[PDB]
Design a protein around this nucleic acid. Structure first.
Ligand SMILES: [Mg+2]
Ligand SMILES: [Mg+2]
Ligand SMILES: [Mg+2]
Ligand SMILES: [Mg+2]
Ligand SMILES: [Mg+2]
Ligand SMILES: [Mg+2]
Ligand SMILES: [Mg+2]
Ligand SMILES: [Mg+2]
Ligand SMILES: [Mg+2]
Ligand SMILES: [Mg+2]
Ligand SMILES: [Mg+2]
Ligand SMILES: [Mg+2]
Ligand SMILES: [Mg+2]
Ligand SMILES: [Mg+2]
Ligand SMILES: [Mg+2]
Ligand SMILES: [Mg+2]
Ligand SMILES: [Mg+2]
Ligand SMILES: [Mg+2]
Ligand SMILES: [Mg+2]
Ligand SMILES: [Mg+2]
Ligand SMILES: [Mg+2]
Ligand SMILES: [Mg+2]
Ligand SMILES: [Mg+2]
Ligand SMILES: [Mg+2]
Ligand SMILES: [Mg+2]
Ligand SMILES: [Mg+2]
Ligand SMILES: [Mg+2]
Ligand SMILES: [Mg+2]
Ligand SMILES: [Mg+2]
Ligand SMILES: [Mg+2]
Ligand SMILES: [Mg+2]
Ligand SMILES: [Mg+2]
Ligand SMILES: [Mg+2]
Ligand SMILES: [Mg+2]
Lengths: 151, 262, 141
RNA sequence: GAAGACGGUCGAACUUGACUAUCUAGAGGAAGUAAAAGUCGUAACAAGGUUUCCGUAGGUGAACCUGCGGAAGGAUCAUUA
RNA sequence: UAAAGUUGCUGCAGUUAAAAAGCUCGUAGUUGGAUCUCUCUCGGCCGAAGCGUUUACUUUGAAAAAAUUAGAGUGUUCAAAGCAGGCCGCCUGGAUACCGCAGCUAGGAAUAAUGGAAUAGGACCGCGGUUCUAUUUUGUUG
RNA sequence: ACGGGGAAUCAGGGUUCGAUUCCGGAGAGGGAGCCUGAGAAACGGCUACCACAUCCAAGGAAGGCAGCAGGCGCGCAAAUU
RNA sequence: AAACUGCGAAUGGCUCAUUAAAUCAGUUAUGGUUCCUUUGGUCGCUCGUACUUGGAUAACUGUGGUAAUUCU
């Protein structure tokens, strides 16, 4: 998978990839070291992020983002943007005059890392709050759980 | 509102000052200082409302401008100086020393201390950071930074500071079984032994504390102040020994005192 | 029957407000046409200039002449017929004089005998009609 | 180092068109409502003197009349091998 | 605003008083039949760790401005108020409750949703493999 | 329609009010642009345009009470230069 | 006294036109920023005329201009 598709050169800023190498240690390529971080709160780092090659500065595991504040869950409704998806959060709002609830929802645009592959319309995503990534995106997908009847 | 605010409405002042409603529109508005505005006792309130040494604000100013009041061993001529928890107020002309200790009902009590005990104080540690060629630094709840602290001293611990020099003399580690006072919230002013601390990563930690009478109560970690090692406090406690009476037993005690009076 | 499920709050509320629009008083108070059409403009009283004295026939079962006045409100220029309550009181009113007018008693609805009249005169030339009637004050000159 | 000038930006506001919200002058035309005791009749209420009413269509000074198809809220809960 | 159970959630009406769509299908919405009685590792028997599918619900705990409201004390001469005051320098207050909803917290598991094996794309025991990899090796070096 | 704390009424549930002394927001005739400053897009600072308006020797100069009093106007409706 | 310098004048007071997920309220975040002041730390850590440096300007003194300004 070629990772150079923009006008600029895509690269993890922390990793230095031009270290001098003698010809005796030139067994193909050096297998460019991968930068990854362990986000806390008991979330495992996907093996894809560790062993991947994608460049994503908004990735919670390989990019420059900090998970802080609220951790929420939603259902994936649309995946038509690049590296970001639209999830749906449903809830019941109480009305005190009638002592009864009404069904409400709100969509949320959340950044989805390339480390989560095979995400389908319908699965559950645990997202975590971060700094503003775009005009409307303030959350990053931290965990993906499949639907109840997946193959 | 452009720029900082300089006034404080009397009804908007913190309730533990015990300010009335009809004396004026405004309140003393504590100056910026080592203690937060909501958690301090301005010098004027203590010197006029509490001790009744002065009748008006001008008399408080006249008292302070003769350099009679010392807060933690230093002369303070600012009448709105924020004096807060564990501060030592010394008046040598009349020869008394007070320590600002929360009462059981969450108010700064007039607590007189001996001059031997007025030479030190206890400070909670807020953070530890290394700077400037690998020199460690401690920051206390009193906004004083101390370089070269003991490597064992960690956050949420308590250090005994010699007021004359400003150096650490000993410390208490934050651990279960150590005596503590609650410095904020519903249980403010209560004294008890730490029983258990539950950690919630990314959120606030809750500390459970058991009184000397067997009562238990929870607080947030930021509301806990280690007072003594084990059951013995390192300072003198106010007349109420940190235990909270319910309104029923308070009424019974008041009635017994009334009956025994005369 | 009505819906009764635990999740029916929105249906109940929407139905209640839609049906609330079918209440006469609620629609009158919240539609905004009544306040626009009200000559007083929502005020309790108003001030006007007496245009002419008029006699209005009482409704059929009882025969009488009700002495009213045509007034022109200062604040919006609308023309109004106002009733001069007591007897001889029409003699206290002149042409082209300031008069303070109030409602008649039922929220812009005609009262008793007088047809199409919902206002009564309270003051004439800044002196109360009751004071003139009881001899407490005289008409200014 | 002042006045000043090219360019850019923010941009009040001006001119010219278009649209839009409220109030409004206004010949006339056509209704509703009261006050209404006039004129022509009698449509409806009794089998109201052609049973009433509904939908549709035409016509007529006026109520209304007629055709078609419905209802009984009908003047028949019933009519005999 | 109450009276107005004349806006009806509590709690109204629809044969004739105003009122059920001409009839059926049908998306969203609303509602929906029985059934199922915590441990393996770490540190000093406990403290720790998960995770039991997730909740809703219920109870508790924390955090939640003052004023206002409720309310404790207190003879403003009484009262509305106030936060004062009492004893012959002392003594004593300036309480407490309540604060939807949402968000934290820890118990309960009836009720109500939700899942867990039916191409075995099953659980547990041992096996064997495949691959990569962290350190044992080891006064030391090496 | 500035939002809350709250207010009136109320068996229980509710309905209505909250410009108004506490907290938060906005504005200083209407827009816009700035200087200084830690902090204004500040108006009891400045620069323009729009609307009003003051003095003038006609060349020019100076404005901003939704601060306290007070006046006009508007009004049913509100206090001492 | 005046004048230069420094600080404040961004608080307070008034009003409710605008404003309909905006304001605001509760809850969280800044591991994404700024912060006069108060308070504490730091301030021989740097290997490179001083027993004190230079030019102004105000107040003040004198000549004024404009019908007129907290003009100059
Ligand atoms: Mg202000
Ligand atoms: Mg945190
Ligand atoms: Mg220039
Ligand atoms: Mg016949
Ligand atoms: Mg007939
Ligand atoms: Mg007939
Ligand atoms: Mg009928
Ligand atoms: Mg009512
Ligand atoms: Mg009732
Ligand atoms: Mg009814
Ligand atoms: Mg009917
Ligand atoms: Mg039917
Ligand atoms: Mg359906
Ligand atoms: Mg069931
Ligand atoms: Mg409160
Ligand atoms: Mg009370
Ligand atoms: Mg709650
Ligand atoms: Mg408005
Ligand atoms: Mg409102
Ligand atoms: Mg208001
Ligand atoms: Mg208004
Ligand atoms: Mg305000
Ligand atoms: Mg402003
Ligand atoms: Mg004005
Ligand atoms: Mg401005
Ligand atoms: Mg002004
Ligand atoms: Mg101002
Ligand atoms: Mg004024
Ligand atoms: Mg007037
Ligand atoms: Mg009045
Ligand atoms: Mg000066
Ligand atoms: Mg200063
Ligand atoms: Mg300043
Ligand atoms: Mg300093």
């Amino acid at each position: 998978a070629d990772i150079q598709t923009e006008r600029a050169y895509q690269k993890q800023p922390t990793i230095f990839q031009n270290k001098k190498r003698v010809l005796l240690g030139e067994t193909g390529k050096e297998k460019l070291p991968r930068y990854y971080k362990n986000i806390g709160l008991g979330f495992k780092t996907p093996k894809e992020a560790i062993e991947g090659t994608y460049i994503d500065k908004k990735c919670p595991f390989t990019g420059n983002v900090s998970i802080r504040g609220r951790i929420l869950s939603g259902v994936v409704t649309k995946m038509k943007m690049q590296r970001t998806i639209v999830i749906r959060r449903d809830y019941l709002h109480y009305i005190r005059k009638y002592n009864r609830f009404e069904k409400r929802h709100k969509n949320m645009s959340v950044h989805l890392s390339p480390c989560f592959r095979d995400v389908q319309i319908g699965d559950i995503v645990t997202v975590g709050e971060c700094r503003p990534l775009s005009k409307t995106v303030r959350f990053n997908v931290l965990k993906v759980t499949k639907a109840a009847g997946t193959k | 509102a452009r720029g900082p605010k300089k006034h404080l409405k009397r009804v908007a002042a913190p309730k533990h000052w015990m300010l009335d409603k009809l004396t004026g529109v405004f309140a003393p508005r504590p100056s910026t200082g080592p203690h937060k505005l909501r958690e301090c006792l301005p010098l004027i309130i203590f010197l006029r409302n509490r001790l009744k040494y002065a009748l008006t604000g001008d008399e408080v100013k006249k008292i302070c401008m003769q350099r009679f009041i010392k807060i933690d061993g230093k002369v303070r001529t600012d009448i709105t100086y924020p004096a807060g928890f564990m501060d030592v107020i010394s008046i040598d002309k009349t020869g008394e020393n007070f320590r600002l200790i929360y009462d059981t009902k969450g108010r700064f009590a007039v607590h007189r201390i001996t001059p031997e005990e007025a030479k030190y104080k206890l400070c909670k540690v807020r953070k530890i950071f290394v700077g400037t060629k690998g020199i460690p630094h401690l920051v206390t709840h009193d906004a004083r930074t101390i370089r070269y602290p003991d490597p064992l001293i960690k956050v949420n611990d308590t250090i005994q500071i010699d007021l004359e020099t400003g150096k650490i003399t000993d410390f208490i580690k934050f651990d279960t079984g150590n005596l503590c006072m609650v410095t904020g919230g519903a249980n403010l002013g209560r004294i008890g032994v730490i029983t258990n601390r539950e950690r919630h990563p990314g959120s606030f930690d809750v500390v459970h504390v058991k009184d000397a009478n067997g009562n238990s109560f929870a607080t947030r970690l930021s509301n806990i102040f280690v007072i003594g090692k084990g059951n013995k406090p390192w300072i003198s406690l106010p007349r109420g020994k940190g235990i909270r009476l319910t309104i029923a037993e308070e009424r019974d005690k008041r009635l017994a005192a009334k009956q025994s009076s005369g | 029957g009505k819906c009764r499920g635990l999740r029916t709050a929105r249906k109940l509320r929407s139905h209640r407000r839609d049906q609330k629009w079918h209440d006469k008083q609620y629609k009158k108070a919240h539609l905004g046409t009544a306040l626009k059409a009200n000559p007083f403009g929502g005020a309790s009283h108003a001030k006007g200039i007496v245009l002419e004295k008029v006699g209005v026939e009482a409704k059929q079962p009882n025969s009488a002449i009700r002495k009213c006045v045509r007034v022109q409100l200062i604040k919006n220029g609308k023309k109004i017929t106002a009733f001069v309550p007591n007897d001889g009181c029409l003699n206290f009113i002149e042409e082209n004089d300031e008069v303070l007018v109030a409602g008649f008693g039922r929220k812009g609805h005609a009262v008793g005998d007088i047809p199409g009249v919902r206002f009564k005169v309270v003051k004439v030339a800044n002196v109360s009609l009751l004071a003139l009637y009881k001899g407490k004050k005289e008409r200014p000159r």
